[PDB]
Paper text:
Although the physiological function of R2lox proteins is not known, the cofactor catalyzes formation of a tyrosine–valine ether cross-link in the protein scaffold. Both contain the ether cross-link, and both co-purify from heterologous expression hosts with a long-chain fatty acid ligand bound in a hydrophobic channel leading from the protein surface to the active site, hence the name ligand-binding oxidase. The two metal ions are bound next to each other in octahedral geometry by two histidines and four glutamates, with the manganese ion occupying the N-terminal metal-binding site 1.
The cross-linking valine, which is completely conserved across the R2lox group, was changed to an alanine, isoleucine or leucine (V72A/I/L). Crystal structures were obtained of all three R2lox point mutants in the non-activated reduced and the oxidized resting state by soaking apo-protein crystals with MnII and FeII under anoxic or aerobic conditions, respectively. The V72A/L mutations were found to have little effect on the global structures of the reduced and oxidized resting states, but an ether cross-link was not formed in the oxidized state. The V72 mutations demonstrate that the Mn/Fe cofactor is capable of oxidizing tertiary, but neither secondary nor primary carbon atoms.
Residue numbers in the entry:
A (entry chain A): 3 to 286
B (entry chain B): 3 to 250, 263 to 286
The structure:
């Protein structure tokens, strides 16, 4: 039952950080995947040999499942904060969920447009990927339906916002630009990636806000945050090494397009993101 | 756990009715309550007598709580359809939920602007209103966390989309126009109502789609729909009568609009 309603008894807290993030989301979130022109992407993909065609699909396979999981698995966080009466967080999360829906749509439209929608891309999810996206992420979020303790909320935001979004997604955006933007391939996908990257800035800020406000009540949760980050790192880098090894064994695209794909630079960027996400949470 | 992902094994079902409704929601759902100019509404409100001021508040109190319940209480429907693999339904429901968030925002901005944000409008929720919005609606939606049977889904969509939205919300939009537009009062609020009414057409279309697809599998669910509608009617009309009595423009015309909405929502679901 509802005991009452904040906007009947009072008003929205207009100065709440998540209300302000909600306002930015509305201003900055107007893009529509359906407006992206993928016609040149189709031409580029058809121009590639079978070998070069593969080069791109592991990254896309990882994003497409990632966005779909993101759309499904944010709902328990919205429920948990709703039940706690955090109306402004809920408002913001409506924009978060609608963002992820557009991300799912964007990658699916690209697969359809380039002619691979019929191809099962699950073959590029190795065991580490599945540990994060098929298992740990839904387990951490779904926990919130029966356990919305500070410990549970911190773990959910860590896995979702700090690891999946703040480490993997961010490193995937960078990787996409380092490879396909340099090669001049897939302009529509790159337009998508840039929209996604803009959206993701708000999603990571929500996670930072959430974790920090819990750490602010008891700095003992800071150690829990660090620990959960470190627990998932082996699967983060396990997946990144899988992708790297795939890239190193599929050299055709980089040769054709005169790219010196510095995979050691990519790996360094992932480590960099992981440690900088840790640093955006303060003990005090 | 996730067993797999539809957009990795295949793609979105581009022809799915809720994907089409999602596409329409993006194209038609751009409005922003922060852009509505409420400055004249403030002046209009200040120009009313004390008694006229209090005459406007019950309808607003009904809506502000209704939108807030709507925002919170659609989440279990999104979860249950997600768990069923109904990906295109979920995509659409992200636009549904963000719509209700903007509706909450719009009424609260109006209350702030005209100077009543500090006033507790719960005084204007009577027992019938509470039965629907404080109790039956959250009860029926939250049930979906543990029971997503066809019967539970039909009941949730009946209470939410056909009664709260399809009967009360639609009747409130009409009421605001019949009263305040003819009076030339609260133009910002009426711009908001127009945007809300446009959004609401999609929300009601989702409820129709959901209820009919369950009815299509077994015609005995049609009788459940009708029964759930009738069960809620006494509270619908008990709240409407309470509002009508406070006002004492043609209240009988308004009251008949509610009955008309109720019946036509019933008619939009087919036995066969
Ligand atoms: C070769 C370097 C590897 C870099 C790592 C690439 C990671 C690709 C996986 C993308 C999944 C991101 C899902 C985002 C979820 C969200 O949007 O909230
Ligand atoms: C004087 C005649 C009364 C007519 C009916 C007035 C009803 C007021 C509306 C309250 C509920 C609105 C909540 C709808 C939720 C949504 O937007 O989905
Ligand atoms: Fe995200
Ligand atoms: Fe609605
Ligand atoms: Mn391994
Ligand atoms: Mn009564
Ligand atoms: Mn995303
Ligand atoms: Mn509404």
């Amino acid at each position: 039952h509802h005991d009452g309603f904040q906007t009947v008894k009072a008003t929205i807290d207009w100065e709440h950080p998540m209300f302000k993030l909600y306002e930015k989301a509305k201003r900055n979130g107007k893009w529509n995947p359906a407006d992206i022109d993928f016609s040149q992407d189709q031409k580029d993909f058809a121009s590639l040999t079978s070998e070069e065609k593969i080069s791109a699909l592991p990254l896309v396979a990882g994003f497409s499942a990632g966005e779909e999981a993101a759309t499904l698995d944010i709902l328990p966080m919205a429920h948990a904060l709703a039940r706690q009466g955090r109306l402004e967080d809920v408002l913001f999360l409506t924009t978060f969920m609608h963002d992820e829906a557009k991300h799912v749509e964007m990658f699916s439209r690209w697969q359809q447009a380039v002619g691979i929608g019929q191809m099962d891309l699950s073959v590029f999810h190795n065991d580490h990927y599945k540990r994060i996206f098929y298992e740990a992420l839904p387990e951490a979020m779904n926990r919130l339906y029966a356990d919305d303790s500070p410990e549970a909320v911190i773990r959910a935001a860590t896995v979702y916002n700090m690891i999946v979004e703040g480490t993997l997604a961010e490193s995937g955006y960078y990787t996409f630009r380092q490879i396909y933007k340099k090669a001049g391939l897939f302009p529509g996908l790159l337009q998508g990636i840039d929209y996604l990257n803009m959206d993701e800035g708000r999603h990571i800020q929500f996670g930072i806000y959430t974790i920090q406000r819990i750490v602010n009540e008891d700095e003992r949760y800071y150690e829990l945050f660090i620990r959960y980050m470190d627990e998932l790192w082996p699967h983060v880098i396990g997946y990144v090494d899988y992708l790297t090894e795939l890239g190193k064994r599929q050299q055709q695209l980089a040769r054709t397009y005169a790219l010196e794909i510095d995979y050691d630079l990519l790996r360094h960027y992932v480590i960099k993101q992981f440690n900088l996400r840790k640093k955006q949470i303060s003990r005090t």
